[PDB]
Amino acid sequence: RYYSSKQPYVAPNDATASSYSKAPKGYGPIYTESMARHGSRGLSSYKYDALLMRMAETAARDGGFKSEAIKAEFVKNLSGITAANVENGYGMLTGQGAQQHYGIGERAYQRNRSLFDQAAADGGTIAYQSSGEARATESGENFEKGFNEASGGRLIGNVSAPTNPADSGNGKDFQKNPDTLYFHKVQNPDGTSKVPGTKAYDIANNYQNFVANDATIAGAEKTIGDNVDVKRASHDLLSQIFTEEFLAKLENGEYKWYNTTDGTKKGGKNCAPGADASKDPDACGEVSKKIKSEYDAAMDLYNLYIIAADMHNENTGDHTFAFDQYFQGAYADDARMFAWALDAEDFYEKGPSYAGQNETYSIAQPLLDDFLNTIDARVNGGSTVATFRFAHAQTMMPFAALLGLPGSTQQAPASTTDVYTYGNNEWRGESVTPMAANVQWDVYARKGEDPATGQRYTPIVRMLYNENEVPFRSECTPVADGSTWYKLTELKSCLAADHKTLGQDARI
Ligand SMILES: [Zn+2]
Ligand SMILES: [Zn+2]
Ligand SMILES: [Zn+2]
Ligand SMILES: [Zn+2]
Ligand SMILES: [Zn+2]
Ligand SMILES: [Zn+2]
Ligand SMILES: [Zn+2]
Ligand SMILES: [Zn+2]
C-alpha cells in the first residue's frame, strides 16, 4: 500500500502485548515514560486537493480526460476528500487518530498496572506534556481517556497540575514543553517563540540554517526530484486519468497551475468550499504552491492516497472518496516510487541523512536529556511515576536516529548522486515514524543496598518502540546475556556521543 509516514498505527496483537519480557528477580516497577507522535490526521492545508482540482478544471475545458466517467470519478474523489477535511478541520486529528491513542493509553496502564495501582494508593502523580499544537494535545487527551477507563478512574486525582497548560478546556491537564517536543523550530505552536540566546533557540536556529543552506542535502533532493524512474511513474500514474495529448502538453511546459482561484499566478487567495478562514485558516492555500510537471501532479495525487488511509472513519456518507483505485495492480510499484521520494525528503532533513554529519538528528538531545532527567528525579525521591509526551514526526525521526533505533542506523553516502534509495538503506517512513509512533521506557529497581558498595542498586531500563520490545544500540551491554534490560548508568554511558560501554560493570 506504501503509505510512507502516513502509515496508520498497527497495535500489538494479544500475543505481542502479553509476551513482554519480565524483569530479573527482585526488581519492581518505579517509573515509566513515553514520547508519542500524534495520531492520524487530515490534510494539513488546502493544497494538494486544491491544485489537482484546478488541473481537473483545465482538463475538463480542454478535453484532456480519458473519458467522462473517469473525469466524474476524479472530480468526486477530490470533492469528497475536501468536504471531509472541511468538516473535520484541516490539520486536525481524525477519529482513527483518537482511537490509536485511546488504545495506546489503555495498554500503557495495563502494562504497568502494579506501578499505577501503587501510585494511586501512595500519592504518586502522572505528568502529561504536549508540544502545544492542537493535534498533539488532542492525541494526548484521547490517550488520557484510554488510560483512565483502563484504570477505572482511580488515577484521575493524581495528575500533576501544569504551570503552563495547553488550554483552558480539556487540555487543562497538559504542560506545554516546546523545548523537548518542538526543538526543531524557533517559533512555538502556541504563537510564542524560543528566546534568542537560550540553548533551545540556538539548537532550533542552527538546525534550520543548516538544512536550508547545506549543499549535499539540496544536491541529493535535486537528484531524486529528477530521477527518471520517478518521472516514468508519474507519467504512467497520470496515464490512467489524462490523455497522452494532455500529458504531452504538460511535460512540454505548456501548462501550469497555481493555488489560486483561477489557477493563474495573478489570482487571489483560494479557500476550501464551505470553510471559514477565521475558524479554519489552513483551509486556505498558500498561493506560491503550484503544479508545473507530471511529477507535481502525481505526487499530489499520491499524498491524497495516503491521507485517505488516515481518514478512514471520515469516509462514509454522501461525499466518499476512493483514491486507492488509482494504485491497484502494477501501479502499486508506482506508489513505491512516490513513497521513496517522500521518504527521501524526510531522510535527508530529519533522519540519519548523509554520512559525515550529525546536525539533522543531534537536535533531539534535549528530549533524550529529559528522558534521563525524569528518571533521575524519580529515583532521587520524586513522586512523578510517569511522564507521557505527545509531539510530532519532526520529533520522533531525529530521536530515532539519535538513539539508533532499528531502521535509523544507516546514513546515506556523502554524495549528491549516490543517494539514499530503497535498495541501499533500511530507512522507511512507515516503520520509523508511522502515525502515533511512540517510544516507551519501563524502569525497575531493586530494594536495599548492594553490599560491598555503600550504594543502592542501579535502576534498569527496558524499551518499547511502537509497542515492540527492542534492545538498545549494539554498543550498549545489557544486564545479562540475551537480556533487553539495561542499567541506567550503562545507558548514560553508551547513549552519549562516545558510545562507550561500562563493560563488566553493566551486568547484574
Ligand atoms: Zn486532560
Ligand atoms: Zn483530565
Ligand atoms: Zn532543502
Ligand atoms: Zn510504472
Ligand atoms: Zn508524460
Ligand atoms: Zn503514456
Ligand atoms: Zn458531509
Ligand atoms: Zn526539502
Author numbering: 8 to 515
The authors write:
The multiple inositol polyphosphate phosphatases (MINPPs) constitute a distinct evolutionary group within clade 2 of the histidine phosphatase superfamily. To gain a wider understanding of the implications of these insertions on the properties of these enzymes, we carried out a crystal structure and mutagenic analysis of a representative member, BlMINPP, a moderately thermophilic, membrane-anchored extracellular enzyme. In keeping with previously reported crystal structures of HP2P family members, the structure of BlMINPP consists of two domains, an α/β-domain and an α-domain. The catalytic center of BlMINPP consists of the nucleophilic histidine (His-45), three arginine residues (Arg-44, Arg-48, and Arg-142), which coordinate the scissile phosphate during catalysis, and the amino acid triplet HAE (residues 339-401) where the glutamic acid residue acts as the presumed proton donor during catalysis.
To this end, crystals of the apoenzyme and of an inactive mutant in which the presumed catalytic proton donor Glu-401 was replaced by a glutamine (E401Q) were prepared, the latter in an attempt to trap the catalytic phosphohistidine intermediate. The structures of the apoenzyme and product complex were solved at 1.65 and 1.71 Å resolution, respectively, whereas a data set collected at 2.40 Å resolution from a crystal of the inactive E401Q mutant yielded a structure of the His-45 phosphohistidine derivative. In the phosphohistidine intermediate, Arg-48 and Arg-142 adopt open-state conformations, neither making contact with the His-45 phospho-group. In fact, this group does not make contact with hinge residues and makes direct contact only with the main chain amide of A400 (A400 forms part of the HAE proton donor motif). It also forms a weaker interaction with Arg-44. The loss of the majority of the interactions observed with the scissile phosphate in the substrate complex are consistent with the relaxation of the phosphohistidine intermediate enzyme to the fully open state. Taken together, these snapshots suggest a mechanism whereby the enzyme undergoes a complex structural catalytic cycle during which the lid closes on binding of substrate, then opens fully to expel the first stage product (a lower phosphorylated inositol). Restoration of the open state conformation in the phosphohistidine intermediate allows product egress, before return to a half-closed state to allow breakdown of the intermediate and generation of the second stage product, orthophosphate.
